[PDB]
């Protein structure tokens, strides 16, 4: 069970730009640096699966769920 601060350092790896949201473009850049070429449909699918509230991005609280799994 990671701590709030541990989970926030990890959040920053994904959230490359300023804002506190992981967008589709940010997640794709992450997934291929970790060696997985993905199609846009596949990115969308990862976002979707995490995107509890439906805006089209992953916020801190959604990232926590995607982390506790």
């Amino acid at each position: 069970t990671d701590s709030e601060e541990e989970i926030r350092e990890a959040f920053r790896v994904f959230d490359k730009d300023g804002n506190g949201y992981i967008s589709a473009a940010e997640l794709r850049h992450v997934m291929t640096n970790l060696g997985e070429k993905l199609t846009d449909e596949e990115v969308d699918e990862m976002i979707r699966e995490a995107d509890i509230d439906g805006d089209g991005q992953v916020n801190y609280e959604e990232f926590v769920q995607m982390m506790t799994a």
Partner: protein
């Protein structure tokens, strides 16, 4: 190349060691950041003098022939005209270190540092060995040097008007080599792709996701999307060393502090290059990002994964991190910057 600009020469890192620094940074694809090295140590590190670890809390010296070394006599140290308590807390410190593998050795200089000392004015002159100086210390202490058959010069001292000269004593290796300040790393920003393998062995069995589901399944992907989030999690987690940062690492019997698997992989690659030139280990511990007593040192030396080098004010430092974070270089900050109002991030920073 040596030194390619002003920042390089201002860093205080000896030319041949910085070359490896630049090289390790490209080889491992990571921005390496450092605290300025006091110029009085530069030369000592270059000719193989030893570098101290977190064990030593003894105060170093910045004057006289003992400049750059860490004097056993706390008064020959920078804490010179300080007083009872200080000079006194100073004693344990010195004594503190010799309890654990550190030896006290006779201070002897190379002819070169001798040149350097007088060239920098730390030593305004000498009879042929009764060296002089205008530091406040010379009105309370007397000095002189003695050549030996090795080429070195023994440093002896005495107290004004008191009587006999004794060599000056300085802390060193268990292996007997004396110590000088170590190169402090401000922070290490690795490119996310350095963690591919690492995520793979945590989650796959070291294989690509496609090869793993092929190897364990059988001819919407819910299972597949799962695995992908799992590698993303794992990757972020080693990049930023979540687990590693919960403990202390050690190098033989010396405590290296809190450091991530990558940060030390970097330490070893640097200490290597260092040995390839004539130096001893120069990075003895982790980064400033896990220092529990953080320094507000205010000019940081930066060496990019591209090899370019530069000096940054704490302000141009945020801009840099942000630029680089945009290129995939990862960064995490000292946990105590926030509560103190000195965070390098301009985001939520909350829950």
């Amino acid at each position: 190349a040596g030194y390619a600009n002003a920042a390089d020469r201002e860093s205080g890192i000896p030319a041949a060691v910085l070359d490896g620094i630049k090289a390790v940074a490209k080889e491992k694809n990571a921005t390496l950041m450092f605290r300025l090295v006091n110029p009085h140590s530069t030369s000592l590190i270059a000719e193989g003098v030893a570098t101290k670890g977190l064990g030593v809390h003894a105060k170093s010296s910045d004057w006289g022939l003992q400049a750059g070394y860490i004097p056993v006599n706390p008064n020959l140290s920078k804490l010179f005209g300080r007083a009872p308590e200080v000079i006194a807390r100073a004693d344990n410190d010195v004594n503190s270190s010799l309890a654990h593998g550190h030896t006290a050795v006779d201070l002897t200089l190379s002819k070169e540092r001798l040149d350097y000392l007088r060239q920098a004015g730390l030593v305004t002159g000498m009879a042929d060995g009764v060296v002089a100086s205008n530091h406040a210390g010379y009105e309370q202490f007397e000095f002189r040097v003695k050549e030996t058959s090795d080429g070195r010069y023994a440093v002896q001292y005495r107290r004004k008007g008191g009587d006999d000269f004794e060599a000056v004593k300085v802390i060193g290796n268990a292996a007997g080599i004396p110590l000088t300040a170590d190169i402090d790393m401000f922070a290490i920003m690795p490119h996310l792709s350095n963690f591919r393998d690492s995520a793979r062995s945590s989650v796959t069995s070291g294989d690509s996701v496609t090869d793993y589901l092929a190897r364990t399944r059988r001819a919407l992907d819910r299972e597949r999307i799962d695995l992908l989030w799992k590698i993303a999690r794992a990757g972020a987690r080693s990049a930023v060393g979540t687990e590693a940062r919960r403990q202390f690492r050690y190098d033989g019997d010396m405590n290296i502090g809190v450091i991530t698997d990558f940060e030390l992989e970097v330490r070893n690659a640097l200490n290597r290059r260092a040995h390839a030139v004539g130096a001893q280990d120069v990075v003895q511990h982790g980064t400033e990002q896990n220092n529990p007593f953080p320094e507000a040192d205010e000019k940081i030396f930066v060496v990019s994964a591209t090899g370019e080098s530069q000096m940054l004010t704490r302000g141009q430092l945020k801009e840099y991190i942000g630029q680089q974070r945009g290129e995939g270089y990862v960064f995490y900050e000292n946990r105590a910057y926030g509560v103190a109002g000195k965070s390098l991030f301009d985001d939520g920073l909350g829950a």
